[PDB]
């Protein structure tokens, strides 16, 4: 589960950081 782990919890973190596109 290298792909499955980084395709759910990791997608949360990145989605948020773009929304702000700042901090």
UniProtKB/Swiss-Prot annotation:
Domain of life: Eukaryota
Modification comment: APOE exists as multiple glycosylated and sialylated glycoforms within cells and in plasma. The extent of glycosylation and sialylation are tissue and context specific. Plasma APOE undergoes desialylation and is less glycosylated and sialylated than the cellular form. Glycosylation is not required for proper expression and secretion. O-glycosylated with core 1 or possibly core 8 glycans. Glycated in plasma VLDL of normal subjects, and of hyperglycemic diabetic patients at a higher level (2-3 fold).
Residues annotated as glycosylated: 23
Subcellular location: Secreted; Secreted, Extracellular space; Secreted, Extracellular space, Extracellular matrix; Extracellular vesicle
Tissues with expression: Produced by several tissues and cell types and mainly found associated with lipid particles in the plasma, the interstitial fluid and lymph. Mainly synthesized by liver hepatocytes. Significant quantities are also produced in brain, mainly by astrocytes and glial cells in the cerebral cortex, but also by neurons in frontal cortex and hippocampus. It is also expressed by cells of the peripheral nervous system. Also expressed by adrenal gland, testis, ovary, skin, kidney, spleen and adipose tissue and macrophages in various tissues.
Associated disorder: Hyperlipoproteinemia 3: A disorder characterized by the accumulation of intermediate-density lipoprotein particles (IDL or broad-beta-lipoprotein) rich in cholesterol. Clinical features include xanthomas, yellowish lipid deposits in the palmar crease, or less specific on tendons and on elbows. The disorder rarely manifests before the third decade in men. In women, it is usually expressed only after the menopause.
Family: Belongs to the apolipoprotein A1/A4/E family.
Role this protein plays: APOE is an apolipoprotein, a protein associating with lipid particles, that mainly functions in lipoprotein-mediated lipid transport between organs via the plasma and interstitial fluids. APOE is a core component of plasma lipoproteins and is involved in their production, conversion and clearance. Apolipoproteins are amphipathic molecules that interact both with lipids of the lipoprotein particle core and the aqueous environment of the plasma.
Additional remarks: Binds to and activates LILRB4 on acute myeloid leukemia (AML) cells which leads to suppression of T cell proliferation and promotion of AML cell migration and infiltration.
Subunit architecture: Homotetramer. May interact with ABCA1; functionally associated with ABCA1 in the biogenesis of HDLs. May interact with APP/A4 amyloid-beta peptide; the interaction is extremely stable in vitro but its physiological significance is unclear. May interact with MAPT. May interact with MAP2. In the cerebrospinal fluid, interacts with secreted SORL1. Interacts with PMEL; this allows the loading of PMEL luminal fragment on ILVs to induce fibril nucleation.
Protein's name according to its UniProt entry: Apolipoprotein E
The organism of origin for this protein: Homo sapiens
Native organism taxonomy: Eukaryota, Metazoa, Chordata, Craniata, Vertebrata
Encoding gene (name): APOE
